[PDB]
Subunit: 286 residues, 3 copies
């Protein structure tokens, strides 16, 4: 094609009125395939067995829970922010994560494009196409998919991440993926639980654990503006919850996105919002 390395001249067309191929129930193309690799490293870290996929004319969404059933994951890729998107209607698919694990891990910088196709022809087949433009090499995966495991709680977890319900969480801040990784990797060296504490007002955010007669650790954020922290905790009121380290380390080590928004409420539930390009990743740990 056009090479200097191949110069990537891709157009972000978004949602199309009709597919290129007539039997396509879904046509997806994206110029950032590493998004899918990091997403499924996250699914691997969570030891998720099955990935629920919902395709609508506007976006595709991947649902999953971790093995310990504590964390819920909702990853939606917006069709208007990708290079090519069409979906005929609302249909669902089920993918075994172990089957596609190595396929997603095979994504490297030699692939400038990922294509996903589902056809009425093969109702139990999902096509994944990775394209190497340096040598015009097309790598096509034929993945056998099933009709979805119902999991009716997804109707309640998609409501839990609504913006009406989100702007009432009293404590929120932002970490880079590097910062979230460092905090919860260092914490995992000594503890499985960490206390998150914040006094009402302009006091620092505190993360700490205490072990008598050996080691106590306290990490304190003395400038709330530098982590985009906002708090609605009443003055002279103490916000204090304990959260598990394991699932947060799984998301942090996956490095799925650039920045990560952390939202906390008083009964211990956290929400992690990791938005990058076309991918909006939400983690609900209850």
């Amino acid at each position: 094609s056009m090479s200097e390395r191949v110069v990537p001249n891709f157009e972000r067309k978004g949602i199309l009125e009709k597919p290129v191929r007539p039997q396509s129930r879904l046509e997806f193309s994206y110029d950032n395939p590493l998004i899918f690799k990091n997403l499924f490293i996250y699914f691997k870290n969570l030891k998720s067995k099955n990935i629920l996929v919902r395709c609508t004319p506007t976006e595709i969404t991947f649902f999953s829970r971790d093995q310990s059933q504590a964390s819920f994951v909702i990853a939606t890729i917006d069709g208007k922010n990708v290079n090519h998107y069409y979906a005929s209607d609302v249909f669902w698919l089920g993918i075994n994560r172990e089957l596609v694990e190595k396929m997603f891990n095979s994504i490297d910088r030699s692939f400038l494009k990922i294509t996903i196709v589902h056809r009425y022809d093969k109702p139990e087949t999902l096509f994944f196409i990775f394209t190497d433009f340096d040598i015009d090499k097309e790598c096509t995966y034929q993945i056998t998919v099933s009709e979805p495991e119902l999991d009716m709680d997804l109707i309640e977890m998609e409501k839990s991440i609504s913006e009406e319900r989100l702007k009432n969480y009293p404590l929120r801040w932002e970490f880079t993926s590097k910062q979230l990784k460092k905090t919860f990797s260092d914490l995992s060296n000594y503890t499985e639980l960490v206390t998150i504490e914040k006094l009402g007002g302009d006091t620092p955010l505190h993360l700490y654990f205490q072990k008598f007669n050996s080691i106590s650790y306290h990490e304190m954020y003395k400038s709330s503006n530098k982590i985009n922290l906002t708090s609605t905790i009443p003055k002279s009121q103490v916000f204090q919850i304990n959260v598990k380290i394991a699932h947060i380390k799984s998301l942090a080590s996956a490095m799925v996105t650039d920045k990560i928004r952390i939202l906390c409420e008083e009964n211990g539930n956290l929400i992690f919002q990791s938005e990058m390009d076309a991918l909006m990743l939400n983690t609900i740990t209850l």
Copy 2:
């Protein structure tokens, strides 16, 4: 000496009429010692036990087979393309690969020169000298070698790589070491055998495997010019062979050279030619 790091001022003299030292049956010197490290990483990947060495007044050749006896390796370093070469006559040596494994792995960028000396004085000793010019440090290895294991098939494998016999292979193309590594690493994630298929004419090269009800994988090269593919397969004739992944991954992971020429024939035999600087590496898998 002359340093800015030491400025390497080495001369490629080639073959000499007589050695520097009088008792030298073989004097070899080369300014690219990493060639030998990658060559013996390959020998290690193949689990080769013994390396057969033939020294002639024109070149030195290393023979070996893999543990499964499927692959044959012929690596010859041309005396006219190295910095210093002399050999009195045609003689053979045998090296235990396990004995010299760590020695070759010790080669790094601090060594700007490898020297190999065999003397009539010590008929069962092979000298390997690595020189660090930053501190004038000379690292000398005294390796005990044996008289060679006969292996008479080498007379038939050196004939098999003749250019008369090579230009009749109907299917050939070229991969970079990175491309050959990616193809056969990704293949090894799901299969032990891959089908190589090519229809006569200007059709794409196809590599694929099929597993019912789980995963099928197909990688297709839509531009034969971009992989230097040439085919003599008759029009409307189908070339189709199955090849083992393991031994090819061993060569690809060794990253011995820059480019790799792949030659296929209809009964499944492959030949890999990897030529870099003074080293010509041939892999015959039958």
Copy 3:
């Protein structure tokens, strides 16, 4: 603060007349925390169980021996070469290395400052504070320390590294940490002991081992000026000792400093002096 990354504007004030906080028996601050990480990688490589710490109004010193009891380590950080130092008197502390192992390993480039505080308030607590200036994040470790294990030989090992006793060692040279690592890693591939030999006069330094009928290895330094070698061995006199590889590889792999001074005497005792910035590291292997 002042950011372009945060521009580090730290002052090296040295020793202060009185602490900032009134109850501080020791106040230590340093703008090179990676020194402590490499120091405790060394302590980990030696499998040291307990670290003896002596704090004086002029400097802080860390003592330890390796598990095999062959090597002694004396690491002193000079208070006049750090950013902030005060100590009320001469007192001693004991630290369990396993307890603080992960804490020191958590030091990365996101921390521009390490602070160590001991208070009369908490006599069995040592505070370690790492500061991330990008987000004003303060990571405080509360380490439980004990009153020191007496180990009276430290009075004899601190005398052994006196400059009066050091300038009589007949053989000394200097390696970069990369060179010391390469020599004793390559040696560890084939041997547990290496012979160090030097003939009196301007002859090369020799390091070698010999194994009959398999492999002999000889590394020779043909330019003594390039490794800053000085010898007081009488002419036509042979200096020859055998030294263990393990403990030297532990120091070399730790990469604690830039250069390393090696001192040898005729009864096999070695001394390694590794001085970097505020840290002076001495290794005595008897």
